[PDB]
Amino acid sequence: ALVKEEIQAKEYLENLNKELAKRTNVETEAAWAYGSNITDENEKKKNEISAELAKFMKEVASDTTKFQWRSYQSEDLKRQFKALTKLGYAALPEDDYAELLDTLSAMESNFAKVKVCDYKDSTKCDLALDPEIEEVISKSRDHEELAYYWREFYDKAGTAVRSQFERYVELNTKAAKLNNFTSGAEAWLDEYEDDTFEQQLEDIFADIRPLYQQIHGYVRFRLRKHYGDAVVSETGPIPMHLLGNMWAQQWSEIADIVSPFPEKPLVDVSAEMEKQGYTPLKMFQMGDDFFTSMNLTKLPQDFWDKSIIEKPTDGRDLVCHASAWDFYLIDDVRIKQCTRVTQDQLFTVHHELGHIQYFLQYQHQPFVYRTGANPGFHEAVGDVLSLSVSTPKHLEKIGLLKDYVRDDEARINQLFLTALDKIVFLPFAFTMDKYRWSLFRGEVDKANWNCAFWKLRDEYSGIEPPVVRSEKDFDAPAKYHISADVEYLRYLVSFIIQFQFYKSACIKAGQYDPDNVELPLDNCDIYGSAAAGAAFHNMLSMGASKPWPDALEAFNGERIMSGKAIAEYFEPLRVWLEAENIKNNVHIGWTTSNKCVS
Ligand SMILES: *[C@@H]1O[C@H](CO)[C@@H](O[C@@H]2O[C@H](CO)[C@@H](O[C@@H]3O[C@H](CO[C@H]4O[C@H](CO)[C@@H](O)[C@H](O)[C@@H]4O)[C@@H](O)[C@H](O[C@H]4O[C@H](CO[C@@H]5O[C@H](CO)[C@@H](O)[C@H](O)[C@@H]5O)[C@@H](O)[C@H](O)[C@@H]4O)[C@@H]3O)[C@H](O)[C@H]2NC(C)=O)[C@H](O)[C@H]1NC(C)=O
Ligand SMILES: *[C@@H]1O[C@H](CO)[C@@H](O)[C@H](O)[C@H]1NC(C)=O
Ligand SMILES: *[C@@H]1O[C@H](CO)[C@@H](O)[C@H](O)[C@H]1NC(C)=O
Ligand SMILES: [Zn+2]
C-alpha cells in the first residue's frame, strides 16, 4: 500500500498547493481592498471570504488523515502534510470563527480610525496618528504637549477596545487548544520549530541587556539636562513621552538632544531629501536599485501598477501601518505605505521591499513553502539593506550626506544613533509578546491586565507612562500589532539575526574585516555586491521548504541564532559608553514605576 500511496500523495499535494494559492489569492484581494479602504461593506466581504477559505481548510485538514503521511519516506512530503494539518484559527467552529473575524475587524478599524483634537485648538479634531500625532511626538520638546497627545491616543486606541480584546484572547485560546497547543503562545512559537526557542532568546537578551542599561542611563542623564529634574528623575523610569516615539520602541528621533558629541556630525538626511525633491516614487525606485545592484530580482510591473505608496487624499479611512503583500500568483506583489520623505521612511521602504524580494524569491515553491524560513527571517531581509543605507559611506555616495568627516567622535555619534534604534528595541519587542503570551497562557487575572503591561515595560525597558494609569485604562492595543493580532517576536528575532546576515554579507562583499581599521562593520555598504546577493538568493529561494537552521546555513554556513554579531557591531560603542557613564557618574538602573495603580 505505502509506496503506491506515497506516489498518489505527491500528486494530491501538487494539486492542493495550487488550489490553496488560488483560493488565498482571492482572500488576499478582499483583505487588500479593506485595508486600503475601510468601509462596512469591505469588512463584510473580507470576513465572508475568509470564512469560506476556513471551511475549505477544515476539509483539507480532515483529508490529510486519509494519508499515512507520517509513514512516508520523503521528508519533503511529510513536511508539506504537516503544514496542511495546521489549521490555526480555521479550527474554530464556523460561528466562533466568524465572531473572531468580527472582533479582529473591530480592533483593527478602531485603531485605523483614531483621530484626536489639536492641543492648541479643540475644534480641529481630525489629527490621525499617521501623520499628525506622530509628527508631534517625534518633533515637539514641549513635555506637556507630548503628554497630551500620549493620553489622547492611548485612551482612544487602547482603552476603547478592552472588551473586544478580551473576547479575542478567549477565541485565540480556544483556537490554539483545538490545534492541541496549550495556548496561542505555543501556537505562535511553533513557527520557530525549536522547543528551546524561548530559552535561547532569554539567553541572548541577558547578554545584551547590560549594554541596554548603559544606553538607558546615558539617555536619562541627557534628558535631565534638557528638561530638568522636575520632568526626569535620576533614579526612576524614563517618562516615555520624551523618547520621540508613541511606544518608546526606538529613540532615534531625540538623537539631537542626547548625541555623545553634539558639536560633531549627526546623520539626519531628511532635510536634504526634501531639498533634492525626493518623492515616495523615487524612494521606492532607489530601493529597487539597491536590490538589483546586488543581482537580486527587480520589482515587477504589477508592483508599480497596484501598490499604494502615498496616503490617499480623498478622506477615506485606511490602515496606514506600512505592509507588504503577496498575492500568491506570479509577480503580483504590492506595498501599502503612507510614505513620507524622511530618513526613517527611506529605511522603512527598504524594510518593506525586503519582504517583496522574499516573495519573489520563493514564488516558484509549493504554496505551503511560500513563506519565510521563520517569521524573523522575513522581517530581517530589508533591515540588512537598511543597515547599509544608514551608513555615512552609502549616504555620501547617493548625495544625501555632505561635508561629513568620519573621525572617532562622528563614529560614536553614528553608533549611538544606530543603537537608539537597534538595541533600545530589543526589550520593547520582547515585552510585546511576553505580555500577550502571559494573557494567552492564563497567567494574569483580568483584573490585573493593564498593570501587567506597564509592569513588563518597566522591568524590561525602564520606561513608564507620562500620567498615572490604572485598570480603568487598557493600553496594550494602542500598539498597532496588538490591535491587529500580529505576532511581535518576529521583530526581536529579526533584530538579532539581521546582524548575523549583515556581518556575513559585509564579509562576502569585501566590506568588513575585523583586522582592518578601514573596513569597520558599522561603515559597510553592500550596495552593488553580487556576492552578498548570491547569499540572499541561496537562502530566500528556499522559502519554508526546510527548517530555518538550513536556511541560515545556505546563507553563511551557520545553523545557530546568535547574539555575537550584534555585540560585535556595537563593541566600540560599549567600550566608549561604559567609560563615559563612569566619567559622568551616571546612575544606572531604575526604581519600580508608580505610574500604574493596581
Ligand atoms: C487533539 O487531541 C485529541 C485527543 O486529545 C485528538 O482527538 C482524538 O483524535 C483521534 C484520532 O482521530 C480520535 O480517534 C478515533 O477514535 C474513535 C473512537 O472515539 C470515540 O470514543 C472516544 C473515547 O473513548 C470519544 O472521546 C470520542 O469522542 C469518540 O466518540 C475510533 O473509532 C477511531 O478509529 C478509527 O481510526 C483508527 C485510527 O486509524 C489510523 O489511520 C489508519 C487508517 O488506515 C490506521 O490503520 C492506523 O493504524 C491508525 O490507527 C483505526 O485504527 C480504526 O480501525 C478506525 O477506523 C479513532 O481511534 C479520538 O476519538 C479523538 N479523541 C478525543 C478525546 O477527542 C485530536 O484529533 C487532536 N487534534 C489535532 C488537531 O491533532
Ligand atoms: C471604497 O469602498 C467603497 C465600498 O464600501 C466603494 O464604494 C468606494 O468606491 C471605495 N473607494 C475607493 C477610494 O476605492
Ligand atoms: C547573477 O545572478 C544569476 C542568477 O541567479 C547568476 O547566474 C549570475 O552568475 C549572477 N551574476 C553576477 C553579477 O554575479
Ligand atoms: Zn516587516
Q: For 332-379, give the DSSP string.
A: -EEEE----SSHHHHHHHHHHHHHHHHHHHTTTS-GGG-S-SSHHHHH
Nearest residue to 502 via CA among 483, 530, 524: 524
The set of cell numbers assigned to 443 is: 497567567
Residues with Cβ within 8 Å of residue 62, at least 6 apart in sequence: none
Is ligand 3 within 6 A of the CB of residue 36?
A: no
Distance from C-alpha of 533 to C-alpha of 528, rounded to nearest angstrom: 9
The set of cell numbers assigned to 360 is: 519573489
Distance from C-alpha of 31 to C-alpha of 276, rounded to nearest angstrom: 36
Neighbours of ion ligand 4 (CB under 5 A): 379
Distance from C-alpha of 31 to C-alpha of 25, rounded to nearest angstrom: 10
Distance from C-alpha of 595 to C-alpha of 466, rounded to nearest angstrom: 8
CA 434 to the chain's CA centroid: 15
Provide long-range contacts, Cβ within 8 A and 24+ apart, for 190-199.
Answer: 190/86, 191/374, 191/375, 191/487, 192/374, 192/375, 192/376, 192/493, 192/548, 193/374, 193/547, 193/548
Compute and round to an integer the Cα radius of gyration of the chain.
24
Left if phi > 0, otherwise alpha if psi is -120 to 50, otherwise beta: which for 331? Answer: left
SS (H, E, C) 146-167: HHHHHHHHHHHHCHHHHHHHHH
Answer yes or no: are the C-beta atoms of 137 and 448 closer than 8 Å.
Answer: no
Distance from C-alpha of 225 to C-alpha of 299, rounded to nearest angstrom: 48
Which residues partner with 334 through β-bridges?
325
Using the CB atoms, write b or e for 335-348: b if 16+ within 10 Å: bbbbbbbbbbbbbb
Considering every ligand atom shown, identify the ligand nearest to the alpha carbon of residue 87 and give its number: 1
Cell 513563506 -> residue: 371
Alpha carbon of 540 to ligand 3 centroid (Å): 15
Alpha carbon of 37 to ligand 2 centroid (Å): 6
Answer yes or no: are the C-beta atoms of 298 and 291 closer than 8 Å.
Answer: yes
Q: Which residues line ligand 2 (CB under 6 A)?
A: 37, 39, 41-42, 314, 316
Answer yes or no: are the C-beta atoms of 273 and 281 closer than 8 Å.
Answer: no
The set of cell numbers assigned to 88 is: 490555526
Distance from C-alpha of 545 to C-alpha of 192, rounded to nearest angstrom: 13
Residues with Cβ within 8 Å of residue 462, at least 6 apart in sequence: 213, 216, 237, 238, 589, 590
CA 332 to the chain's CA centroid: 23
202 is catalytic: no
Catalytic residue among 216, 350, 481, 537: 481
The set of cell numbers assigned to 75 is: 521528508
Answer yes or no: are the C-beta atoms of 99 and 167 closer than 8 Å.
Answer: yes
Nearest residue to 143 via CA among 241, 246, 257, 254: 241
SS3 state of residue 324: strand
Distance from C-alpha of 570 to C-alpha of 576, rounded to nearest angstrom: 10
SS3 state of residue 266: coil
SS3 state of residue 175: helix
115 CB neighbour count, 10 Å cutoff: 15
- Do the strands 323-326 and 333-336 form a parallel or antiparallel pair, or are they unpaired? antiparallel
468 CB neighbour count, 10 Å cutoff: 12
Q: Determination method here?
A: X-ray
Nearest residue to 342 via CA among 275, 289, 393: 275
Which residues partner with 238 through β-bridges?
463
Residues with Cβ within 8 Å of residue 512, at least 6 apart in sequence: 503, 506, 519, 520, 521, 524
Instruction: Identify whether 131 is preceded by a cis peptide bond (ω within 30 of 0).
Output: yes
Distance from C-alpha of 91 to C-alpha of 286, rounded to nearest angstrom: 43
Distance from C-alpha of 193 to C-alpha of 549, rounded to nearest angstrom: 10
User: What was the resolution (in A) of this experimentally determined structure?
Assistant: 1.9
- The identity of residue 457, as a single letter, is R
Answer yes or no: are the C-beta atoms of 231 and 239 closer than 8 Å.
Answer: yes
The C-alpha angle with vertex 71 and arms to 65 and 72, in degrees rounded to 5, equals 100
Residues with Cβ within 8 Å of residue 407, at least 6 apart in sequence: 264
- The identity of residue 297, as a single letter, is T
Alpha carbon of 510 to ligand 2 centroid (Å): 51
Distance from C-alpha of 326 to C-alpha of 300, rounded to nearest angstrom: 13
28 CB neighbour count, 10 Å cutoff: 20
Residues with Cβ within 8 Å of residue 589, at least 6 apart in sequence: 213, 217, 462
Answer yes or no: are the C-beta atoms of 452 and 226 closer than 8 Å.
Answer: no
Taking CA atoms, 187 is separated from 88, 438, 459, 566, in Å, by 8, 13, 26, 28
Alpha carbon of 381 to ligand 4 centroid (Å): 9
Considering every ligand atom shown, identify the ligand nearest to the alpha carbon of residue 175 and give its number: 1
The C-alpha angle with vertex 88 and arms to 375 and 77, in degrees rounded to 5, equals 75
140 CB neighbour count, 10 Å cutoff: 17
241 in a labelled binding site: no
Tell me the CB-side half-sphere exposure of residue 524, using CA atoms within 13 A: 28
Distance from C-alpha of 524 to C-alpha of 361, rounded to nearest angstrom: 24
Taking CA atoms, 289 is separated from 23, 99, 294, 299, 379, in Å, by 33, 44, 9, 9, 20
Catalytic residue among 352, 394, 464, 537: 352
Q: Enumerate helices (H) and strands (E) in the chain, giving the number of each.
A: 24, 6
Distance from C-alpha of 416 to C-alpha of 419, rounded to nearest angstrom: 5
Nearest residue to 561 via CA among 82, 202, 185: 202
Cell 530581517 -> residue: 380
SS3 content of the chain, % helix, strand, coil (to 5): 65, 5, 35
DSSP 310-322: S--SS------S-
Q: Identify the burial level of 217 via C-beta atoms within 10 angstroms of its C-beta, where 0-12 means exposed, 13-18 middle and 19 or more buried.
A: buried
The C-alpha angle with vertex 230 and arms to 474 and 423, in degrees rounded to 5, equals 60
Answer yes or no: are the C-beta atoms of 150 and 245 closer than 8 Å.
Answer: no
Cell 507520517 -> residue: 70
Please tell me the residue having the least CA distance from ligand 1 atom 49: 68
Please tell me the residue having the least CA distance from ligand 2 atom 10: 37
SS3 state of residue 596: strand
Cell 509578546 -> residue: 433
SS (H, E, C) 457-512: HHHHHCEECCCCEECCCCCHHHCHHHHHCCCCHHHHHHHHHHHHHHHHHHHHCCCC
Cell 476539509 -> residue: 59
CA 531 to the chain's CA centroid: 27
Alpha helices (H) in 362-424, listed in sequence order? 375-389, 392-397, 408-422
**DSSP one-letter code for 300:** P
Is ligand 3 within 6 A of the CB of residue 298?
A: no
The set of cell numbers assigned to 286 is: 532607489
Distance from C-alpha of 567 to C-alpha of 366, rounded to nearest angstrom: 37
143 is catalytic: no
Residues with Cβ within 8 Å of residue 170, at least 6 apart in sequence: none
Distance from the first to the final alpha carbon of the chain: 63
The set of cell numbers assigned to 18 is: 495550487
Which residues partner with 336 through β-bridges?
308, 323
Distance from C-alpha of 548 to C-alpha of 541, rounded to nearest angstrom: 13
Distance from C-alpha of 549 to C-alpha of 376, rounded to nearest angstrom: 12
Q: Identify the burial level of 3 via C-beta atoms within 10 angstroms of its C-beta, where 0-12 means exposed, 13-18 middle and 19 or more buried.
A: exposed
Provide long-range contacts, Cβ within 8 A and 24+ apart, for 255-260.
Answer: 255/416, 255/417, 255/420, 257/141, 257/222, 257/223, 257/226, 258/218, 258/219, 258/222, 258/223, 258/416, 258/420, 259/413, 259/416, 259/417, 260/409, 260/412, 260/413, 260/416, 260/576, 260/577, 260/580
The total number of residues written for the chain in this structure: 598
Nearest residue to 265 via CA among 396, 419, 138: 396
Distance from C-alpha of 389 to C-alpha of 383, rounded to nearest angstrom: 9
Residues with Cβ within 8 Å of residue 412, at least 6 apart in sequence: 260, 261, 572, 573, 576
DSSP 44-88: HHHHHHHHHHHHHHHHHHHHHTTS-GGG-S-HHHHHHHHHHH--G
The torsion defined by the Cα of 468, 472, 477 and 478, in degrees rounded to 10, comes to: -40
87 CB neighbour count, 10 Å cutoff: 17
Answer yes or no: are the C-beta atoms of 249 and 492 closer than 8 Å.
Answer: no
316 CB neighbour count, 10 Å cutoff: 11
Answer yes or no: are the C-beta atoms of 596 and 454 closer than 8 Å.
Answer: yes
- Do the strands 596-597 and 469-470 form a parallel or antiparallel pair, or are they unpaired? parallel
Residues with Cβ within 8 Å of residue 585, at least 6 apart in sequence: none
